Design a protein around this ligand. Structure first.
Ligand SMILES: CCCCCCCC/C=C\CCCCCCCC(=O)OC[C@H](COP(=O)(O)OCC[N+](C)(C)C)OC(=O)CCCCCCC/C=C\CCCCCCCC
Ligand SMILES: CCCCCCCC/C=C\CCCCCCCC(=O)OC[C@H](COP(=O)(O)OCC[N+](C)(C)C)OC(=O)CCCCCCC/C=C\CCCCCCCC
Ligand SMILES: CCCCCCCC/C=C\CCCCCCCC(=O)OC[C@H](COP(=O)(O)OCC[N+](C)(C)C)OC(=O)CCCCCCC/C=C\CCCCCCCC
Ligand SMILES: CCCCCCCC/C=C\CCCCCCCC(=O)OC[C@H](COP(=O)(O)OCC[N+](C)(C)C)OC(=O)CCCCCCC/C=C\CCCCCCCC
Ligand SMILES: CCCCCCCC/C=C\CCCCCCCC(=O)OC[C@H](COP(=O)(O)OCC[N+](C)(C)C)OC(=O)CCCCCCC/C=C\CCCCCCCC
Ligand SMILES: CCCCCCCC/C=C\CCCCCCCC(=O)OC[C@H](COP(=O)(O)OCC[N+](C)(C)C)OC(=O)CCCCCCC/C=C\CCCCCCCC
Ligand SMILES: CCCCCCCC/C=C\CCCCCCCC(=O)OC[C@H](COP(=O)(O)OCC[N+](C)(C)C)OC(=O)CCCCCCC/C=C\CCCCCCCC
Ligand SMILES: CCCCCCCC/C=C\CCCCCCCC(=O)OC[C@H](COP(=O)(O)OCC[N+](C)(C)C)OC(=O)CCCCCCC/C=C\CCCCCCCC
Ligand SMILES: CCCCCCCC/C=C\CCCCCCCC(=O)OC[C@H](COP(=O)(O)OCC[N+](C)(C)C)OC(=O)CCCCCCC/C=C\CCCCCCCC
Ligand SMILES: CCCCCCCC/C=C\CCCCCCCC(=O)OC[C@H](COP(=O)(O)OCC[N+](C)(C)C)OC(=O)CCCCCCC/C=C\CCCCCCCC
Ligand SMILES: CC(C)CCC[C@@H](C)[C@H]1CC[C@H]2[C@@H]3CC=C4C[C@@H](O)CC[C@]4(C)[C@H]3CC[C@]12C
Ligand SMILES: CC(C)CCC[C@@H](C)[C@H]1CC[C@H]2[C@@H]3CC=C4C[C@@H](O)CC[C@]4(C)[C@H]3CC[C@]12C
Ligand SMILES: CC(C)CCC[C@@H](C)[C@H]1CC[C@H]2[C@@H]3CC=C4C[C@@H](O)CC[C@]4(C)[C@H]3CC[C@]12C
Ligand SMILES: [K+]
Lengths: 40, 49, 294, 244, 294, 40
C-alpha cells in the first residue's frame, strides 16, 4: 500500500445497482406468481 | 369522527411548533418548510381512498 | 357533555377515568417507554464497539477534495467600498479568524511541532494509523510565508486600498496523498513553467472570455514562492493521531482590479486524484465575485 | 396510522435536538402514497375469526370505529418502536461515514449553511456542503427502507385482532403479494440509475438493510404476547386497554 | 507450591487472585446467572399462558384405561397367614384407605352430590368443559353397595378367615365414555348372560388351564348386583370442574380358595374403547397372585 | 361430537415417522453433496 492507496476511496456502486435490480425483479415475479396461482 | 381527531393532533403540533420556531430564532424560509413537513406527516394522504 | 366529560362528582372521574386508571396507564407507559429507551441504548452501544477511533470506515463521499477560502461570502461575492470602513469588516473578521491559528506562539518547542524543509519537498510517513507511537508530529507553517496578506503588517490585508487577498485552502482528508500532473506533452498551458513536482498548483482565471481584460495581475504567495501546496504537509493522520496539525495555505492578491464592476474569478487546482463536479462548485475549484466599488 | 409516528418524530427531534433532517417530505409522500397502499387494500380480504352472525348489533352511541384504544396502539406503542428503528438506521449511517452521535447535536445551523465548505466531523475531516447533503439523502433512503421493514411485522400483527397467526393462517394471497411488492418497490427506487436527479435517493450498502430487523421481530413478539392475555383473561386490563 | 498457591503475603493473594478479582468474578457470575434465571422464568410464564385449565391438550398416552385394585401388592402377590394377625395388616390399611373416601358423611346435601338411579343407567352430560355453569355435580356411590367387602361389618374385609376381597377400579380419564360390547353373535362366552347394556363387565379367571380347578367361586359385588361399572358415572369432567367426584368400584370375593398354594388370577374388563397391551400388564386387565397359607 | 369423540384420543404417528424419515434422508444427501462438491 502507501502512496498508491487509491482503492481506499473507490466503491463499485455499478455492480451493486445491477444486483439490487436483479433481486427486485425476482421478488416482483414471485409476487405475480403467487397472485395468479389458483386462477389456472 | 376520525377526521376530527386527526385534525386535532395536526393543529396541536403545527401552531405549537410554529410558535416554537420563532421562539428559537428560526427565519421565515425555514419555518415554512417545517410547517409543511408537519402537515404532511400528520395527514394520512392515502386512507380515504 | 362539555362539563360532565370534564368532571363529574358521583363516580369521582376526571376526563373519563378515576385516579387508579390514570395511575395504571401512566405506570404502564413509564415501564414500556423505559424498556424502549434501554433497548435503543444497548443497540447503540454495540455500535460504538463496531467502529474504530483512528479511521473512518467509509471514505468515498470525500474522495475528490474541495477548495475553500478565507473570506466568508454569502453568495460567493466580495463587494465593499474603499471609503466606508464598516463595509469590509465582516470579511476581515473572518480572514483574521483563519490566520489567528497559525500564530508562532502556538507553534513552539519540539513537541509536537517539527521544522521542515523551507522549500517544497516530498511526502513524509510517520508510520501507520496506530497508537503504538505516541502523538505524531506535524510540520510548522509560518504566517510570514504569506508576504503581503498576513495581517502582521496591514491588518486589513488589502481591502483598505482596492487590493484584496484571498487565502485558499485544500480540504483535509485522512490518508490522502496529493498527486500532481507529470511533465509529459499533455499538461495545461499555465502549468508548464515552474514544474516543481513537489507542489500542487493552484491557478485562478476569469469565468468568461470577456472578463480576462478586466482582471489585472493575479499575484500568488505560498511556500517557497510557488503557487501551490507543498507535498510535505501530507498525508493527514486525523485529529486523534495528530492534534495541533496545520494545513498549508495559499494567498492570492487580485492587484489591478477594475473599479465599479462585477468580476467572476474561478480558481482551480490541478492533479491526478483531483476531479471536478458540475453539481458541486467547490470540488477542486471555487468561484468568487469580486466588486471593489469606490 | 402506525407509520405516522416514524414520520412525525424526525421533524420533532429536528427542532428540539438540532440534528440533520432525518426524513424529508418527498420520502413521506413516497411512504403513504406508495408502499402502504397495497397492504392496506389487502387487509380487506381477511376472513372471519370467530362467529359474527352470533353477536348482538353494535351500539351507535357507544361503540365506534376509531376509539382511543387504537390511538394507544398505533400512535402509542407500535409507531414508537418503528420510529426508534428508523432513528437507529439513521445514526448508523452517519456514524459509519464519520459523524458520531456526540457531534451531531448542535450542528444543524452549519449543516444546512450553504456557504460553509469546511464542516469538521468527529475525526477531523473537512466536508463540503454537497458532500454532507448526499449523506443526508442516503439517510432518508435508509429511513424509508426501515419503515418498510417494520411495516412487515405491522401488517402481520394487524392481520388478526385477537386470534394468533398460527391459528388463522396466512391464506390471504393478496397480503403476501403486498409484502413482496412493498419490498421490490423500495429496492427499485433506490437502485435505479438517475434516481438522484428525480427523487433524491442514493444506493445503500448491503450491511445497512439489516438495521431494522430486530425492531420488527420485537414488534411481532410484543403483539403476539398481547393477543394472548386477551384470550386467557377475558374482561381484564389488556382487553379494556388494548382491544381496539 | 503447596503453601504459596494458597496464601502469599507480598501480593496479598488467596488461591491466586486478590480481593478485587474474586469480587469482579463473583459480581459477573451473579449478574450473568441472574439474567439466565429471569429469561428461563419468562419463557416458562408464556408457557403457563399457552395451556388450558380444564383440559389436557394431549390425551393419547392414556387412551386405553387401566385396571387397578385396592390392595397394595409389592409383586402383585397377596400372601398372608390366617393365624398371625400381623400378616394382613399392610393390606387392610390400604383397602381401608381406599374405602375411607366413600364415607356417607362426605357425601351429603344437594351440593355437590346428586342421587342417581339405583340401577345401572346411561351416560349423563352436564354440559361442556367450561366454567359457565358452576361446579358440575357427580353421582353418589354408597359403601353398602359392596355387600360383604365394606369394612362396615367385618373391618378386616375377609382376610380373617380365608376369604379375601379385591376392590377393582377403572382409571379416571377426562371425557372418556365407556362403550360395552353389543349383543351380536360374536361376544365371549362369559358375557352372554346378564347383558345390561349400561354395565361395563369385569370378569376374573385363571391364567393357566390347570389352576381353574383350584380357584373356587368368584363372587362379584357391584351397583345393581352386576359385575361391572354403571355407565351413569361417566364421563369425568376433571378435578377443576368436578372436585368431590367418586368413581364406581367393584368388589371381588375369592371364596373357596385352595390352601397353601400360589394361585394366579387374571381379571379383565371387556369393551369397545378398551384394548390390552402385551407390555403394560395393567392396561384393561390385572394380575394377582393369591396364596392364603394357613 | 359427544359420545363418538374417539378421534380426541388418536394421533397419526405413522405419517409423522414417514415424513421425518424423508426429511432425514434429504438432509443426509445434501450433506454428501456439499462434502464431495469440489472433488469433481
Ligand atoms: C423468475 C425469474 C425473473 C427473471 C427476471 C429477469 C429480468 C431481466 C433481467 C435483468 C433486468 C435488470 C436490468 C439491469 C439494468 C442495470 C442498469 C444499471 O446498472 O445502470 C447503472 C448505470 C448508472 O450508474 P452511475 O454511474 O450513474 O451511478 C451513479 C454514480 N454516482 C452517483 C456516484 C456518480 O446505468 C447507466 O449509466 C445507464 C442506464 C440506462 C438505463 C437502464 C434502464 C434501467 C431502469 C429500469 C429497469 C429495471 C427494472 C427491474 C424490474 C423492477 C420491477 C419493480
Ligand atoms: C417519542 C419519540 C422518541 C424518539 C427517540 C429518538 C432518539 C434520539 C433522541 C435524541 C438523540 C440525541 C443524540 C444522541 C447522542 C448522545 C450522545 C451521548 O450520549 O454520548 C455519550 C456516549 C458516547 O460515548 P463515547 O465518548 O465513547 O463516544 C464517542 C467517543 N469518541 C468520539 C471520543 C471516540 O453515547 C452513548 O454511550 C450512547 C448514548 C446514545 C444516545 C441515546 C439517548 C436516547 C435518549 C432517549 C431515547 C428513548 C426514547 C424512548 C421513547 C420516549 C418517548 C417519550
Ligand atoms: C429476524 C427477522 C425478523 C423479521 C420479522 C418480520 C417477520 C414477518 C415476515 C414473515 C413472518 C412469518 C410467520 C410464519 C407464520 C407461519 C404460520 C403457519 O404456518 O400457520 C399454519 C397455518 C394453519 O393451517 P390450518 O391448520 O388452519 O389449516 C387447515 C386446513 N384445512 C382446513 C384443510 C384443514 O397454515 C396456513 O396458514 C397455510 C399455509 C400457509 C403457508 C405460508 C407460508 C408463507 C409464510 C411467509 C411469507 C414470506 C413473507 C416474506 C416477506 C419478505 C419479502 C421480501
Ligand atoms: C404488475 C405490474 C408490474 C409493473 C412493473 C413496472 C416496473 C417498471 C420498471 C422500470 C421502469 C423505470 C423507469 C425507467 C427510468 C429510466 C431513467 C434513465 O434511464 O435515466 C438515465 C439518466 C441518467 O444519466 P446520467 O447517469 O448521465 O446522469 C448523471 C447525473 N448527474 C451526474 C448530474 C448526477 O437519467 C437522467 O439523466 C434523468 C433521470 C430521469 C428520472 C426518471 C425516473 C422516473 C422517476 C419516478 C417514476 C418511478 C415511479 C415508480 C413506478 C413503479 C412501477 C411498479
Ligand atoms: C402501488 C403503485 C406504485 C407506483 C407509485 C409510485 C411511487 C411513488 C409515489 C409518489 C411519489 C410522489 C413524490 C413527488 C416527488 C417529486 C420530486 C420532485 O419534483 O423533485 C424536483 C426535481 C428537481 O429537478 P431539477 O430542476 O433539479 O432538475 C435539473 C435537471 N438539469 C439541470 C440537468 C436540466 O424535478 C424532477 O425530478 C422532475 C421530474 C418530476 C418527478 C415527478 C414524479 C411523480 C411521482 C409519482 C406521481 C404518480 C403516482 C401515481 C401512483 C399513485 C399510486 C396509488
Ligand atoms: C419464508 C419466506 C422466504 C422468503 C425468501 C425470499 C427470497 C430471498 C431472495 C434473495 C436473498 C439472497 C441474496 C443473496 C445475494 C448475494 C449477492 C452478493 O454477492 O452479496 C455480497 C454481499 C457482501 O457485501 P460487502 O459489502 O461485504 O462487499 C461489497 C463489495 N463490493 C461492493 C466492492 C463489490 O453480501 C450480501 O449482500 C449478503 C446477502 C444477504 C444474505 C442472506 C441472509 C439470509 C437471512 C435469513 C435466512 C435464513 C434461512 C435459514 C433456513 C431455515 C430453513 C428451515
Ligand atoms: C430478536 C431480534 C432479531 C434480530 C436479527 C438481526 C439479524 C441481523 C442480520 C445480519 C447482521 C448484520 C451483518 C453484519 C455484517 C458486518 C460486516 C463487518 O464488516 O463486520 C466487521 C465487524 C468487526 O469489526 P472489528 O472492528 O471488530 O474488526 C477488527 C478486525 N481486526 C481484529 C483485524 C482489527 O463485525 C461485527 O461487528 C459483527 C458484530 C455483529 C454482532 C450482532 C449479531 C447479530 C445477531 C444474529 C445475526 C443473524 C444470523 C443468524 C440468522 C438466524 C436466522 C433465523
Ligand atoms: C446449574 C444448573 C441450574 C439448572 C436450572 C434448572 C431449572 C429447574 C430447577 C428447579 C425446578 C423446580 C420446579 C419448577 C416449578 C416451580 C413451581 C412454581 O414456581 O409454581 C408457581 C408458578 C405456577 O403458577 P400457577 O399456579 O399459575 O401454575 C399452575 C396453576 N394451576 C395448576 C392451578 C392451574 O410457576 C411460575 O410462575 C414459574 C416458575 C417456574 C420455576 C422456575 C424456577 C427456576 C429457578 C432457578 C432457575 C435459574 C437457574 C440459573 C442457573 C443458576 C446456577 C446456580
Ligand atoms: C441457510 C441454511 C438453510 C438451511 C435449509 C435446510 C432445509 C430445511 C428442509 C425442510 C424444512 C421444511 C419442512 C416442511 C415440512 C412440512 C410437512 C407438514 O405437513 O408439516 C405439518 C406440520 C403441522 O403439524 P401439526 O402438529 O399442526 O399437525 C399434525 C397432524 N397430524 C399429526 C394428525 C397429521 O407443520 C410443521 O411441521 C412445520 C414445519 C416447519 C416449518 C418451516 C419453518 C422454517 C423456519 C425458518 C426459515 C425462514 C426462511 C426465511 C427466508 C429468508 C430468505 C432470505
Ligand atoms: C436429494 C433427494 C433425496 C431423496 C432420497 C430418497 C430416499 C428414498 C425415499 C424414502 C426412504 C424412506 C423409507 C420410508 C420407510 C417408512 C417406514 C415407516 O414409516 O414405518 C412405520 C411403521 C411402524 O409404525 P408403528 O405402528 O410401529 O409405530 C409405533 C406405534 N406405537 C408405538 C404407538 C404403538 O413401520 C412398520 O410397521 C414396518 C417397518 C419395516 C421396516 C422399514 C425400515 C425403515 C428403516 C430405515 C430406512 C430409513 C433410512 C432413511 C435414511 C436416513 C439416513 C440417516
Ligand atoms: C430487556 C431490556 C429491558 C434490557 C435493557 C437493558 C438496558 C437498561 C441496559 C442494556 C445495555 C446497558 C448499557 C450498556 C453500556 C453502557 C456503558 C457503560 O460504560 C455504562 C452502562 C451503560 C450505559 C448500560 C446502561 C444499561 C443498559 C442500556
Ligand atoms: C433481558 C432480561 C435480563 C430480562 C429478564 C426479565 C425478567 C426478570 C422478567 C421477565 C418476565 C418476568 C416475570 C413474568 C411473569 C410474572 C408473573 C407475575 O404474576 C409476577 C411477576 C413475574 C414473576 C415476572 C418477574 C420478572 C420476570 C421474570
Ligand atoms: C439454518 C437454520 C436457521 C435452519 C434451521 C432449520 C430447522 C428449523 C429445521 C431443520 C430440521 C427441521 C425439522 C426436521 C424434522 C421434522 C419432522 C417432520 O415430520 C415435521 C418438520 C420437522 C419438525 C422439521 C421442522 C424444522 C427443522 C427443525
Ligand atoms: K403521513
Amino acid at each position: 500500500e502507501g502512496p498508491d492507496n487509491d482503492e481506499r476511496f473507490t466503491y463499485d456502486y455499478y455492480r451493486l445497482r445491477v444486483v439490487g435490480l436483479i433481486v427486485a425483479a425476482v421478488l416482483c415475479v414471485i409476487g405475480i406468481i403467487i397472485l395468479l396461482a389458483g386462477k389456472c | 369522527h376520525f377526521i376530527h381527531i386527526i385534525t386535532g393532533v395536526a393543529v396541536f403540533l403545527g401552531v405549537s411548533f410554529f410558535i416554537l420556531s420563532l421562539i428559537l430564532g428560526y427565519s421565515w424560509l425555514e419555518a415554512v418548510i417545517f410547517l409543511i413537513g408537519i402537515i404532511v406527516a400528520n395527514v394520512p394522504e392515502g386512507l380515504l381512498a | 357533555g362539555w362539563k360532565k366529560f370534564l368532571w363529574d362528582s358521583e363516580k369521582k372521574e376526571f376526563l373519563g377515568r378515576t385516579g387508579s386508571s390514570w395511575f395504571k396507564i401512566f405506570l404502564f407507559y413509564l415501564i414500556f417507554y423505559g424498556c424502549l429507551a434501554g433497548i435503543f441504548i444497548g443497540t447503540i452501544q454495540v455500535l460504538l464497539l463496531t467502529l474504530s477511533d483512528f479511521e473512518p470506515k467509509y471514505q468515498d463521499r470525500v474522495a475528490p477534495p474541495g477548495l475553500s477560502h478565507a473570506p466568508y461570502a454569502i453568495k460567493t461575492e466580495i463587494s465593499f467600498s474603499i471609503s466606508n470602513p464598516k463595509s469590509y469588516e465582516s470579511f476581515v473578521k473572518s480572514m483574521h479568524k483563519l490566520m489567528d491559528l497559525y500564530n508562532e506562539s502556538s507553534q513552539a518547542g519540539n513537541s509536537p511541532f517539527e521544522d521542515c524543509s523551507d522549500t517544497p519537498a516530498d511526502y513524509i510517513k510517520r508510520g501507520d494509523l496506530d497508537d503504538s507511537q505516541g502523538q505524531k508530529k506535524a510540520c510548522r507553517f509560518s504566517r510570514m510565508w504569506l508576504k503581503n496578506c498576513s495581517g502582521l503588517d496591514d491588518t486589513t490585508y488589502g481591502y483598505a486600498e482596492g487590493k484584496p487577498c484571498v487565502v485558499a485552502k485544500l480540504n483535509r482528508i485522512i490518508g490522502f496523498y496529493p498527486k500532481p500532473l507529470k511533465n509529459t506533452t499533455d499538461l495545461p498551458e499555465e502549468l508548464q513553467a515552474n514544474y516543481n513536482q513537489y507542489v500542487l498548483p493552484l491557478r485562478c482565471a476569469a469565468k468568461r472570455e470577456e472578463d480576462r481584460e478586466k482582471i489585472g495581475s493575479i499575484e500568488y504567495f505560498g511556500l517557497g514562492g510557488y503557487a501551490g501546496f507543498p507535498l510535505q504537509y501530507y498525508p493527514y493522520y486525523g485529529k486523534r493521531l495528530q492534534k495541533k496539525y496545520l494545513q498549508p495555505l495559499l494567498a492570492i492578491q487580485f492587484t489591478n482590479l477594475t473599479q465599479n464592476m462585477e468580476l467572476r474569478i474561478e480558481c482551480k487546482v490541478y492533479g491526478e486524484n483531483i476531479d471536478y463536479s458540475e453539481k458541486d462548485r467547490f470540488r477542486g475549484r471555487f468561484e468568487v465575485k469580486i466588486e471593489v466599488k469606490s | 396510522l402506525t407509520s405516522n409516528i416514524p414520520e412525525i418524530t424526525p421533524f420533532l427531534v429536528f427542532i428540539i435536538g438540532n440534528v440533520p433532517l432525518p426524513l424529508g417530505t418527498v420520502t413521506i409522500l413516497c411512504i403513504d402514497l406508495g408502499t402502504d397502499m397495497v397492504p392496506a387494500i389487502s387487509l380487506a380480504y381477511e376472513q372471519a375469526e370467530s362467529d359474527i352472525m352470533k353477536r348482538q348489533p353494535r351500539n351507535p352511541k357507544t361503540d365506534k370505529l376509531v376509539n382511543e384504544r387504537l390511538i394507544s396502539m398505533a400512535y402509542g406503542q407500535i409507531g414508537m418502536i418503528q420510529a426508534l428503528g428508523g432513528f437507529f438506521s439513521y445514526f448508523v449511517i452517519l456514524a459509519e461515514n464519520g459523524f458520531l452521535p456526540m457531534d451531531l447535536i448542535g450542528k444543524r445551523v452549519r449543516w444546512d449553511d450553504r456557504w460553509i465548505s469546511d464542516v469538521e466531523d468527529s475525526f477531523g475531516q473537512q466536508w463540503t456542503y454537497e458532500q454532507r447533503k448526499i449523506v443526508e439523502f442516503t439517510c432518508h433512503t435508509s429511513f424509508f427502507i426501515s419503515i418498510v421493514v417494520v411495516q412487515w411485522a405491522d401488517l402481520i400483527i394487524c392481520k388478526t385482532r385477537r386470534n394468533s397467526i398460527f391459528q388463522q393462517g396466512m391464506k390471504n394471497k393478496i397480503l403476501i403479494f403486498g409484502l413482496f411488492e412493498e419490498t421490490a418497490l423500495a429496492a427499485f427506487l433506490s437502485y435505479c440509475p438517475g434516481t438522484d436527479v428525480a427523487l433524491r435517493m442514493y444506493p445503500l450498502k448491503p450491511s445497512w438493510w439489516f438495521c431494522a430487523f430486530p425492531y420488527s421481530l420485537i414488534i411481532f413478539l410484543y403483539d403476539e404476547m398481547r393477543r394472548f392475555i386477551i384470550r386467557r383473561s377475558p374482561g381484564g386490563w389488556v382487553e379494556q386497554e388494548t382491544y381496539y
